[PDB]
């Protein structure tokens, strides 16, 4: 009955971003949120300099109408000096500093020349083609705000200003555990209705990729005491505690009881497919997310619910979770009204070079394989029914957590 | 003059993928190329189980007509091994093993309780709702081929099969360094035509994010001897050595001379923007890549020439460099024929919900901003000239490296 949107907002509304901070050299700062504005120690460019390669000119000698001969020149970290002879232009080259008292710059390609005077064409505006000191960054100004996620895009600019290190929010810490008599670890035999734990490994891998500190307390044994202790310890060392499965998501049993007695926890039933149940509330000193047990359900729930929560918790000012984009279905899709289906899809170029989703296969949450052969979701609007070939449909490309990049 | 495509092929055609291998537990394998096929050790599912919450039944019961008791239940962990007498039924969770003789299962929503047990409202089709042992994965069957780069997709599936670890190819080793008297580290003064070193930091980052093992040799000093040892060292400890800037890309000087004396290095001039120069060739025991000095050039070149190289080298069987997709420019673009301009661009939804690039701004290589403001390249076909609003265009979305 509850909508992904309503729940997403319900979660994020109560989250107060972390603000503890440490200061590390740029090379360690990838994907780390910035603690405080970065303030440029130097003007960049450091001095007014030539837009193109061509000729630096005084506006005096232009309609002067006689051609102007190259008296001198300025290039890279070599400047120009020796008082500018009135009447002459100066062969200057892109990036190069202008000589004192210049007034414009003209691309020699515009202007044909000769062996004793260079002749210009257009009337050539004032200040033309002088990239000025600090046009790109001014000293004292704000280069990257608090909250900017550091990528290869921002960190080299920082390095360019002579800075060796920046303040950044501490990594988010997320404690992780599973439970249930059915669950066994690699090695052990399989009892009767037994399976190996997979959700925990799945949530770990994505937490680490997302840049969290994971604390993985294993498979708490099926006893209301083991469990109380799992929570005391998880809550004591994390900002978020995540049940990969086994702790209850609505069904009564001693796990619902330890949860209710150890914090304030809601038990949502979201209008999504796959999934539906999702457990979530405050603990003594952390947040709790309680994944449903089905691998696909858990994964998708985490991906669309918990992932966005860790972003806000990190200090990140962005809206961390890919954009969708409308594309034509090349496959008939079985959608049932009443639930928002995050079916899995395959974005491929048609013969025309445009995009079109194909379905991955059977969308039953009885199998994980759709994450592999897909590269995106097909978000199928809540109220929509079945979809025919050629109809339009929203699509959300996966991200790093599932392939490429 | 030489075309991107030509260089790519030429680089890739000599590169032999790594085959050294180590075996680490699943939780450490993210992003890591798999060494040999994952063979399924068990049938998955491993026992017929309920696709649904409800009760296990038989057709001869149902058939009769009247309701029927509930002689026990099969739960998640708990399997029912009771007698299961006739004209009764067994309550079943979901993913619960189906009891012996179960010949179908019925949804909790097609039943009404009774004083004397349970009534089945609707039809019961034989075999209905029984997820059958082996229908998803057959034991003995290759689940994942060698060369599968491992993500959240494949690694949980492997744990589902009881598997604690897997052989993966060893991480790729990349030595990185820069040189030149203009180059200063943080803290030091900015003498005359000097700068603070940035191409190295940029390249370290991308390398690390790409899952490579980085060996950063700092800024080698402007001495033919320092540089020679730097190379001998980088080559003796890496699969790839990468001058982030400083070592020559064409120009004559003691760097070109050291390179030429120490390996077989081409000096290409590519038909691209931004960029043009790029040095590449074998060394004694590794590959050498020579980035151009300029930051945007050295980034773009790394991303489009080196990234795809490091991918082939890793063991990965995919094509490790996003697909492009065609889209309308909503901004007038300045392109010059003769080079393939990798302009920088901003994808977004219009009012109609469909994609369209805008330019980031000035595409001059005198600034780094476009990699931040943008979320993609506009790949403007070599021969194309200026492109007007509403024209169609290829667009390659950025990736993780630029956020």
Short mmCIF file of C-alpha atoms in Angstrom, two decimals, chain A residues 43-385:
data_model
loop_
_atom_site.label_atom_id
_atom_site.label_comp_id
_atom_site.label_asym_id
_atom_site.label_seq_id
_atom_site.Cartn_x
_atom_site.Cartn_y
_atom_site.Cartn_z
CA UNK A 43 44.61 33.25 -9.33
CA UNK A 44 44.28 30.91 -12.22
CA UNK A 45 45.29 32.20 -14.66
CA UNK A 46 47.99 34.02 -12.73
CA UNK A 47 48.25 36.95 -15.19
CA UNK A 48 46.51 38.18 -18.35
CA UNK A 49 47.41 35.97 -21.33
CA UNK A 50 46.79 35.34 -25.04
CA UNK A 51 43.55 33.70 -26.19
CA UNK A 52 44.83 32.47 -29.58
CA UNK A 53 48.19 32.50 -31.28
CA UNK A 54 48.39 35.50 -33.55
CA UNK A 55 49.39 39.07 -32.87
CA UNK A 56 49.07 41.41 -29.85
CA UNK A 57 48.13 44.96 -30.84
CA UNK A 58 47.46 48.49 -29.55
CA UNK A 59 44.09 49.72 -30.75
CA UNK A 60 45.87 52.96 -31.76
CA UNK A 61 47.56 51.26 -34.74
CA UNK A 62 44.63 49.49 -36.51
CA UNK A 63 42.61 51.97 -38.64
CA UNK A 64 45.94 53.77 -38.61
CA UNK A 65 45.58 51.64 -41.73
CA UNK A 66 49.28 51.10 -42.42
CA UNK A 67 50.25 47.48 -41.80
CA UNK A 68 52.18 46.63 -38.64
CA UNK A 69 55.44 44.57 -38.61
CA UNK A 70 56.21 41.97 -35.86
CA UNK A 71 58.74 43.80 -33.64
CA UNK A 72 58.78 41.10 -30.93
CA UNK A 73 57.21 38.12 -29.16
CA UNK A 74 56.02 36.34 -25.96
CA UNK A 75 55.36 32.55 -25.57
CA UNK A 76 54.98 30.11 -22.60
CA UNK A 77 56.96 30.59 -19.34
CA UNK A 78 59.16 32.92 -21.42
CA UNK A 79 57.65 36.46 -21.26
CA UNK A 80 58.31 39.60 -23.36
CA UNK A 81 60.12 42.84 -22.33
CA UNK A 82 61.94 45.86 -23.77
CA UNK A 83 59.38 48.70 -24.16
CA UNK A 84 56.93 48.19 -27.05
CA UNK A 85 57.94 50.11 -30.24
CA UNK A 86 54.97 52.29 -31.18
CA UNK A 87 53.50 51.34 -34.57
CA UNK A 88 54.25 47.57 -34.43
CA UNK A 89 52.21 44.44 -33.59
CA UNK A 90 53.67 41.55 -31.54
CA UNK A 91 53.54 37.88 -32.51
CA UNK A 92 52.13 36.34 -29.36
CA UNK A 93 50.97 32.76 -28.87
CA UNK A 94 48.02 31.21 -27.05
CA UNK A 95 48.61 30.82 -23.30
CA UNK A 96 51.40 33.39 -23.51
CA UNK A 97 51.43 36.44 -21.24
CA UNK A 98 50.61 39.72 -22.90
CA UNK A 99 53.20 42.49 -22.87
CA UNK A 100 52.41 45.48 -20.64
CA UNK A 101 49.74 47.81 -22.02
CA UNK A 102 48.35 45.53 -24.77
CA UNK A 103 44.74 46.13 -25.88
CA UNK A 104 43.67 43.15 -28.09
CA UNK A 105 44.71 39.88 -29.83
CA UNK A 106 44.11 38.67 -33.42
CA UNK A 107 44.41 35.19 -34.91
CA UNK A 108 47.00 35.42 -37.75
CA UNK A 109 44.62 33.15 -39.72
CA UNK A 110 42.11 36.05 -39.99
CA UNK A 111 45.00 38.28 -41.12
CA UNK A 112 47.17 37.61 -44.22
CA UNK A 113 50.69 39.14 -43.87
CA UNK A 114 54.05 40.04 -45.56
CA UNK A 115 57.89 40.65 -45.07
CA UNK A 116 57.61 44.29 -43.73
CA UNK A 117 53.98 44.89 -42.50
CA UNK A 118 51.03 42.76 -41.21
CA UNK A 119 47.54 43.70 -42.27
CA UNK A 120 44.48 43.02 -40.21
CA UNK A 121 40.92 42.40 -41.44
CA UNK A 122 38.02 42.80 -38.96
CA UNK A 123 37.70 45.99 -36.88
CA UNK A 124 38.61 43.79 -33.89
CA UNK A 125 36.83 44.77 -30.63
CA UNK A 126 38.44 46.15 -27.44
CA UNK A 127 39.87 43.64 -24.91
CA UNK A 128 39.57 41.02 -27.65
CA UNK A 129 41.18 37.66 -26.93
CA UNK A 130 42.85 38.38 -23.60
CA UNK A 131 42.16 35.60 -21.11
CA UNK A 132 42.55 37.63 -17.89
CA UNK A 133 44.15 36.68 -14.57
CA UNK A 134 41.63 34.64 -12.51
CA UNK A 135 38.99 34.39 -15.21
CA UNK A 136 38.76 30.66 -14.49
CA UNK A 137 39.49 30.84 -10.76
CA UNK A 138 40.01 34.00 -8.64
CA UNK A 139 42.11 33.77 -5.45
CA UNK A 140 39.99 33.91 -2.32
CA UNK A 141 36.96 32.35 -4.15
CA UNK A 142 35.04 29.09 -3.76
CA UNK A 143 36.20 26.27 -6.09
CA UNK A 144 34.20 23.36 -4.60
CA UNK A 145 31.53 23.64 -1.86
CA UNK A 146 31.18 21.54 1.30
CA UNK A 147 29.33 18.48 0.19
CA UNK A 148 30.96 17.93 -3.18
CA UNK A 149 31.78 14.29 -3.87
CA UNK A 150 35.40 14.12 -4.97
CA UNK A 151 36.05 12.56 -8.35
CA UNK A 152 38.80 12.72 -10.99
CA UNK A 153 36.93 15.76 -12.20
CA UNK A 154 37.56 17.92 -9.01
CA UNK A 155 40.69 16.51 -7.38
CA UNK A 156 43.18 17.51 -10.11
CA UNK A 157 41.98 21.15 -9.93
CA UNK A 158 42.60 21.14 -6.16
CA UNK A 159 46.13 19.75 -6.84
CA UNK A 160 46.64 22.47 -9.41
CA UNK A 161 46.32 25.14 -6.68
CA UNK A 162 49.15 23.63 -4.63
CA UNK A 163 46.92 21.99 -2.02
CA UNK A 164 48.09 18.58 -0.71
CA UNK A 165 45.07 17.59 1.44
CA UNK A 166 41.46 18.40 2.20
CA UNK A 167 38.98 17.97 5.03
CA UNK A 168 36.32 15.33 4.27
CA UNK A 169 33.48 13.75 6.21
CA UNK A 170 34.52 10.45 7.88
CA UNK A 171 33.47 7.29 6.07
CA UNK A 172 29.95 6.14 6.92
CA UNK A 173 29.93 2.99 9.03
CA UNK A 174 27.37 0.28 8.38
CA UNK A 175 27.12 -2.87 10.42
CA UNK A 176 25.69 -5.89 8.70
CA UNK A 177 24.32 -9.22 9.79
CA UNK A 178 22.03 -12.10 8.87
CA UNK A 179 20.19 -14.79 10.83
CA UNK A 180 17.94 -17.85 10.47
CA UNK A 181 18.17 -21.62 10.98
CA UNK A 182 18.08 -22.18 7.22
CA UNK A 183 21.36 -20.37 6.65
CA UNK A 184 24.71 -22.06 6.30
CA UNK A 185 28.23 -20.86 5.48
CA UNK A 186 30.46 -22.08 2.66
CA UNK A 187 32.00 -25.41 3.58
CA UNK A 188 29.22 -26.76 5.82
CA UNK A 189 26.86 -29.42 4.33
CA UNK A 190 23.30 -28.56 3.42
CA UNK A 191 20.78 -29.82 5.97
CA UNK A 192 17.18 -30.22 4.87
CA UNK A 193 15.57 -26.91 3.81
CA UNK A 194 18.91 -25.17 3.83
CA UNK A 195 20.64 -22.63 1.63
CA UNK A 196 23.85 -20.71 1.77
CA UNK A 197 23.62 -17.10 2.93
CA UNK A 198 23.86 -14.76 -0.08
CA UNK A 199 22.22 -11.45 0.77
CA UNK A 200 24.91 -10.52 3.33
CA UNK A 201 27.69 -10.93 0.78
CA UNK A 202 25.50 -8.95 -1.63
CA UNK A 203 24.97 -6.06 0.81
CA UNK A 204 28.67 -6.12 1.81
CA UNK A 205 29.95 -5.82 -1.69
CA UNK A 206 27.72 -2.83 -2.46
CA UNK A 207 28.43 -1.06 0.86
CA UNK A 208 32.20 -1.31 0.14
CA UNK A 209 31.80 -0.11 -3.38
CA UNK A 210 29.71 2.78 -2.14
CA UNK A 211 32.62 3.72 0.12
CA UNK A 212 31.30 2.69 3.54
CA UNK A 213 33.03 1.02 6.41
CA UNK A 214 31.32 -2.40 6.78
CA UNK A 215 31.19 -4.27 10.03
CA UNK A 216 30.08 -7.73 9.26
CA UNK A 217 29.07 -9.67 12.34
CA UNK A 218 28.26 -12.84 10.44
CA UNK A 219 25.14 -15.01 10.91
CA UNK A 220 23.80 -14.38 14.39
CA UNK A 221 22.62 -17.76 15.73
CA UNK A 222 18.89 -18.34 16.12
CA UNK A 223 18.44 -17.38 19.74
CA UNK A 224 16.79 -14.22 21.13
CA UNK A 225 19.95 -13.59 23.23
CA UNK A 226 22.58 -13.89 20.44
CA UNK A 227 20.38 -11.39 18.68
CA UNK A 228 20.00 -8.78 21.43
CA UNK A 229 23.82 -8.82 21.50
CA UNK A 230 24.18 -8.45 17.75
CA UNK A 231 22.18 -5.26 17.99
CA UNK A 232 23.98 -3.81 21.06
CA UNK A 233 27.30 -4.32 19.24
CA UNK A 234 26.11 -3.23 15.83
CA UNK A 235 24.49 -0.07 17.23
CA UNK A 236 27.57 0.65 19.32
CA UNK A 237 29.92 0.69 16.29
CA UNK A 238 27.79 1.88 13.33
CA UNK A 239 25.70 4.71 11.99
CA UNK A 240 23.57 2.11 10.19
CA UNK A 241 22.78 -1.53 11.00
CA UNK A 242 21.38 -3.64 8.14
CA UNK A 243 19.70 -7.03 8.40
CA UNK A 244 20.58 -8.88 5.18
CA UNK A 245 17.75 -11.21 6.14
CA UNK A 246 16.30 -13.25 8.97
CA UNK A 247 15.40 -10.41 11.27
CA UNK A 248 11.66 -9.96 10.74
CA UNK A 249 10.06 -7.58 8.20
CA UNK A 250 6.52 -7.91 9.62
CA UNK A 251 5.98 -11.55 10.55
CA UNK A 252 5.66 -12.14 14.32
CA UNK A 253 8.51 -14.13 15.96
CA UNK A 254 11.23 -13.45 18.52
CA UNK A 255 13.10 -11.24 16.06
CA UNK A 256 10.20 -8.87 15.72
CA UNK A 257 10.25 -8.92 19.56
CA UNK A 258 13.95 -8.03 20.00
CA UNK A 259 13.54 -5.27 17.44
CA UNK A 260 10.47 -3.75 19.04
CA UNK A 261 12.11 -3.87 22.50
CA UNK A 262 15.44 -2.38 21.25
CA UNK A 263 14.20 0.57 19.25
CA UNK A 264 11.43 2.35 17.38
CA UNK A 265 10.92 0.41 14.13
CA UNK A 266 8.21 0.78 11.41
CA UNK A 267 7.17 -2.21 9.21
CA UNK A 268 6.36 -0.94 5.76
CA UNK A 269 4.81 -2.82 2.93
CA UNK A 270 5.83 -0.95 -0.19
CA UNK A 271 4.04 -0.99 -3.47
CA UNK A 272 6.98 -2.39 -5.36
CA UNK A 273 7.80 -5.41 -7.36
CA UNK A 274 9.88 -7.24 -6.46
CA UNK A 275 9.83 -6.79 -2.72
CA UNK A 276 7.12 -5.26 -0.53
CA UNK A 277 8.17 -5.71 3.11
CA UNK A 278 10.81 -3.38 4.51
CA UNK A 279 11.72 -2.81 8.16
CA UNK A 280 13.22 0.51 9.26
CA UNK A 281 13.56 2.74 12.33
CA UNK A 282 15.86 4.30 14.88
CA UNK A 283 17.96 2.27 17.27
CA UNK A 284 19.62 3.55 20.42
CA UNK A 285 22.46 5.19 18.45
CA UNK A 286 22.00 4.26 14.71
CA UNK A 287 19.63 3.53 11.84
CA UNK A 288 18.15 0.16 11.07
CA UNK A 289 17.19 -1.31 7.74
CA UNK A 290 15.65 -4.71 7.54
CA UNK A 291 15.76 -6.30 4.18
CA UNK A 292 13.25 -8.90 3.11
CA UNK A 293 14.72 -12.41 2.77
CA UNK A 294 14.39 -13.02 -0.94
CA UNK A 295 17.80 -12.26 -2.64
CA UNK A 296 16.28 -10.18 -5.39
CA UNK A 297 13.85 -8.44 -3.08
CA UNK A 298 16.66 -7.58 -0.68
CA UNK A 299 18.98 -6.43 -3.36
CA UNK A 300 16.42 -4.18 -5.07
CA UNK A 301 15.13 -2.86 -1.80
CA UNK A 302 18.67 -1.91 -0.64
CA UNK A 303 19.58 -0.47 -4.06
CA UNK A 304 16.54 1.83 -4.20
CA UNK A 305 16.07 2.54 -0.45
CA UNK A 306 19.28 2.12 1.52
CA UNK A 307 21.72 3.29 -1.07
CA UNK A 308 20.04 6.77 -1.20
CA UNK A 309 20.01 6.91 2.60
CA UNK A 310 23.83 6.32 2.82
CA UNK A 311 24.38 9.19 0.35
CA UNK A 312 22.46 11.75 2.47
CA UNK A 313 24.18 10.32 5.54
CA UNK A 314 27.63 10.87 4.01
CA UNK A 315 27.22 14.62 3.69
CA UNK A 316 26.70 14.47 -0.06
CA UNK A 317 24.73 17.45 -1.49
CA UNK A 318 23.90 15.55 -4.76
CA UNK A 319 20.83 13.26 -5.35
CA UNK A 320 22.71 9.93 -5.60
CA UNK A 321 20.68 7.45 -7.72
CA UNK A 322 20.77 7.42 -11.57
CA UNK A 323 18.38 9.25 -13.79
CA UNK A 324 15.85 7.36 -15.79
CA UNK A 325 15.28 8.11 -19.44
CA UNK A 326 12.38 7.25 -21.73
CA UNK A 327 12.98 4.56 -24.38
CA UNK A 328 10.93 2.15 -26.56
CA UNK A 329 10.38 -1.48 -25.45
CA UNK A 330 11.40 -4.11 -28.01
CA UNK A 331 9.77 -6.85 -25.89
CA UNK A 332 6.22 -7.42 -24.55
CA UNK A 333 6.18 -6.86 -20.76
CA UNK A 334 3.93 -8.44 -18.13
CA UNK A 335 3.08 -5.75 -15.61
CA UNK A 336 0.25 -5.89 -13.16
CA UNK A 337 -1.50 -2.71 -11.89
CA UNK A 338 -1.17 -1.81 -8.21
CA UNK A 339 2.62 -2.19 -7.92
CA UNK A 340 5.62 -0.28 -9.31
CA UNK A 341 7.62 -2.93 -11.16
CA UNK A 342 11.40 -2.54 -11.33
CA UNK A 343 11.70 -5.18 -13.99
CA UNK A 344 15.17 -5.76 -15.37
CA UNK A 345 16.14 -4.83 -18.84
CA UNK A 346 18.82 -4.60 -21.48
CA UNK A 347 19.65 -1.29 -23.09
CA UNK A 348 21.00 -1.82 -26.59
CA UNK A 349 21.44 0.32 -29.74
CA UNK A 350 18.91 -0.43 -32.54
CA UNK A 351 19.99 -0.50 -36.18
CA UNK A 352 19.24 3.29 -36.19
CA UNK A 353 21.76 3.96 -33.38
CA UNK A 354 19.02 4.82 -30.82
CA UNK A 355 18.21 3.04 -27.58
CA UNK A 356 15.62 0.35 -26.84
CA UNK A 357 15.14 -1.98 -23.86
CA UNK A 358 14.78 -5.71 -24.25
CA UNK A 359 13.67 -7.82 -21.28
CA UNK A 360 16.19 -10.01 -19.50
CA UNK A 361 13.87 -12.98 -19.31
CA UNK A 362 11.55 -14.19 -16.55
CA UNK A 363 11.14 -11.49 -13.84
CA UNK A 364 10.39 -13.90 -11.03
CA UNK A 365 12.21 -13.10 -7.82
CA UNK A 366 12.94 -16.84 -7.62
CA UNK A 367 16.26 -16.12 -9.54
CA UNK A 368 19.16 -13.58 -9.41
CA UNK A 369 20.36 -13.97 -13.05
CA UNK A 370 18.52 -10.78 -14.23
CA UNK A 371 21.14 -8.59 -12.54
CA UNK A 372 23.83 -10.10 -14.72
CA UNK A 373 22.19 -10.14 -18.17
CA UNK A 374 20.54 -6.79 -17.55
CA UNK A 375 22.13 -3.41 -17.49
CA UNK A 376 19.12 -1.46 -16.27
CA UNK A 377 15.73 -1.34 -14.70
CA UNK A 378 12.53 -0.95 -16.61
CA UNK A 379 10.52 1.14 -14.18
CA UNK A 380 6.93 0.34 -15.00
CA UNK A 381 4.58 2.92 -13.64
CA UNK A 382 2.46 1.83 -10.74
CA UNK A 383 -0.86 2.00 -12.50
CA UNK A 384 0.29 0.65 -15.90
CA UNK A 385 -0.84 -2.82 -16.96
#
